[model samples]
Target: VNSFSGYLKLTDNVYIKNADIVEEAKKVKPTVVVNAANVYLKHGGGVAGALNKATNNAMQVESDDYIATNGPLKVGGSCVLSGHNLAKHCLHVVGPNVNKGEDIQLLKSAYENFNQHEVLLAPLLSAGIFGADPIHSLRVCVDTVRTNVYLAVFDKNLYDKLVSSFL
Candidate 1:
C-alpha cells in the first residue's frame, strides 16, 4: 500500500495521496489492486473525473467503486456543447482550446462516468475557450465548473456556491 500527503489550497488542509489510497485498500485484503489509468475511453470517465464527481458530492467509496462499474457513456455529437443524462448527469462545461475531437471525447467520457454515479462535476476551462492567456482560460474553466461543484482553483473568477472548503 502507498500513502501520500498534499495540500488543498481551498481547504487549507493536508490530504492523503494515492499511496495512502492503496494502503487503506490493502488493509482490507492482502491482494489489493489499483489502476492508474487517466485516459478517458469510449465508454467511461477516468479516475480523475470520478474523483471529481465524488468530491463534489462529499461522498467516499472504496476502489471497488471503479472495479464493478458499468463504465462511462458515449454522448458526443454536434451542437452538444455539454449535456448530461438523468442516469449519468455529467456537469459539462466547455473550455477554450478544446478541439472538436477533444470536446467530443471529453463529453463522451464524462457522460460515461455519469452512468456509474448520480452527480457529475467538471472544470470547463480556466481561460476563455482558445483564449490568448492561460490565466483567462483557467478563470473561465474554473468559473464554469464552480457553478455546479465546489471547485478549488487559483482563478478567483471561478466561484462556487459553497462558501467554505471541503477537506
Candidate 2:
C-alpha cells in the first residue's frame, strides 16, 4: 500500500481518502463502487469511464441494460449493477450538471441516496465536469452521508487540495 496519501477523518465512519479509487474498490469491495454517470448512465470518460474500463465494458453493458429496462435515471437517482471482476456491486449515480441549470441539491440527493450502503468507495461527485465547486460539493456530501465512505482521489494535486481544506 502507498503511504504517500492525504486524508481527512471526518468522523469515525466518514473519511475522505486519497488513493487509487479503482484499486481501492477492488480491494475493499464496498457495498457498491460508485460510478459518476449521466442520467443515461453513459461512461463517456472520467471515473465513470475508468470504472467501466476496469470492468472491460461489463459495467457499461449492464448499465445500458438497466436504462433500457428502467429508463434513464433522474439527477438525484441511482441504480445498482454488477461490478463484475472489480467488485461485487456497482452503484451508478447521476448528479445534476450545473451547466444544465440544475441546482446543487440534486448532487446532495445523489450522495444521500447511496448513503444506505454499509460502505462506499466513490469520487467527489459534481466536482469535475459536472462543474460544482469541489470543496463545496465535498462538504455537502460529507454532511449528508453516514456510510463508511472513502472518497477516492487519484491525483496528488486534488488530494492535496481536498486534504488541505477538509482535514
Candidate 3:
C-alpha cells in the first residue's frame, strides 16, 4: 500500500489514464470500487455499461457483493439508474473528472438512490489518480457524503490500516 494525498484541484486538472484505476485501488482498497467505465459515449468496462449488469446481479442473483474500480466511471451517469433496475439494492462510489458542473446531478442521483433503495455506498473522488489535489478530494467527499448521502471513504486512519495490514 502506498501513502496518498486525497486531494484534486479542479483548476490544476488531472489526466486519468486507463491504468490508474488498478494502481489507485491497490493503494486505497476502495470498498465500493467505481470502475470508470463509460463516459461521454465512450464504451467498455466503464461504469455505464457494467453497472446495470453488476447491480442486477447483486440484487437478483444475490451472490456476493459487487466492486467497481476505474476513473471514467460516471457516478451521476447512466449507472446511477441501476438503483431502479436491481431487485435488491445498489450503491455508488464516485470521483470527479474535469467537470464540476455535474455536481448537482451527482448529488441528486446519490440522494435518490439512498432514499429510494437504501443503497448507500461510497462515492469516489478523483484524488491521487488524476491531477486532483489529494486534500481537496478528501475534504469535498467527506462533507458531501455525510450531509447528502452515505459514508464513502474509510476512516482517517486508513493509512494506518494499510500499513499495519501489509506489514
Candidate 4:
C-alpha cells in the first residue's frame, strides 16, 4: 500500500509526490502530463504503459497517429498527444537510454521540451528502465522545468530519495 501525503514541495513552485501520474493527473486535472518516451513514441512500459492502460489503449493508438503524421520523435525531442481522461494534453519526451551510460545533457534535454502547461505533471524520467542515474535525473528534471511542475512519483523509496534532494 502507498504511504505518504502524495504531495511534497521542492520549491515554491515545484512539487513532488508519491502517486500514479495518470490517476493523479485525473484528479488534479492539470493542463498536461509528461511521459518519458522512446524515440519511436511507443507507449510500451513505465509511464508510457501506465498512460496507455489508463486510456484503455488509446494512448498507443494516438501515439501511432502522431508518428504517422509527424514521424518518429527523436531523442531529446518531444511531441504531444491528446489526454484521454486525465490532463488536457500528454507531452511525450524521448529521454536518454543509459544502458549505454547516462547522458546528463540529453536527459536534460528530455525535460527541457515541455508544453508550458499551466499545471504540469511529470515523473522521474529515465530513472527506471532507461537506466539514468536517479540523482542526476532528479537534478535535470527539477532544473529544466519551465513551469510549475507537479511531479508524480511512484513508491516510497523513490519518493524518499527525491524528497531527500530538497531537504
Q: Give the alpha-carbon lDDT of every model.
A: 0.27, 0.79, 0.34, 0.77
User: Could you tell me which 10 consecutive residues in candidate 2 have the lowest summed lDDT?
Assistant: 1-10
For model 1, what is the alpha-carbon lDDT of residue 103?
43
User: Which digits, one per residue and each the tens of the lDDT, describe model 2 over residues 1-167?
Assistant: 32213556777666777677788877776667888888988897888888888888888888888889999988988887887876678888888889789888887798887677877778888867888888887888878888777788777788778778874
For every model in order, what is the number of clashing pairs? Answer: 24, 0, 24, 0
How does residue 26 of candidate 4 score in lDDT?
A: 74
**Where's the lowest-lDDT run of ten residues in candidate 4?**
1-10
- Pairs that collide, model 4: none
Q: How close is candidate 1 to the true structure, as a TM-score?
A: 0.23
lDDT digits (tens) for residues 88-166 of candidate 1: 2222322212423344224333323223322222232312232324333333323332221222232343333122322
Stretches > 4 Å off in candidate 2: 1-8
Error of 2 at 144 (Å): 0.2
Ranking by TM-score: 2, 4, 3, 1
Task: For each candidate, give its TM-score against the true structure.
Answer: 0.23, 0.89, 0.33, 0.88
Listed per candidate, the RMSD to the true structure in angstroms reads 13.1, 3.0, 12.2, 3.8
lDDT for position 85 in model 2 = 76
Compose the digit string of candidate 3's lDDT tens values, residues 27-138.
4443333433324323233332344354444332321122223334455443432333322223343434444434433533432323333223333444333234434443
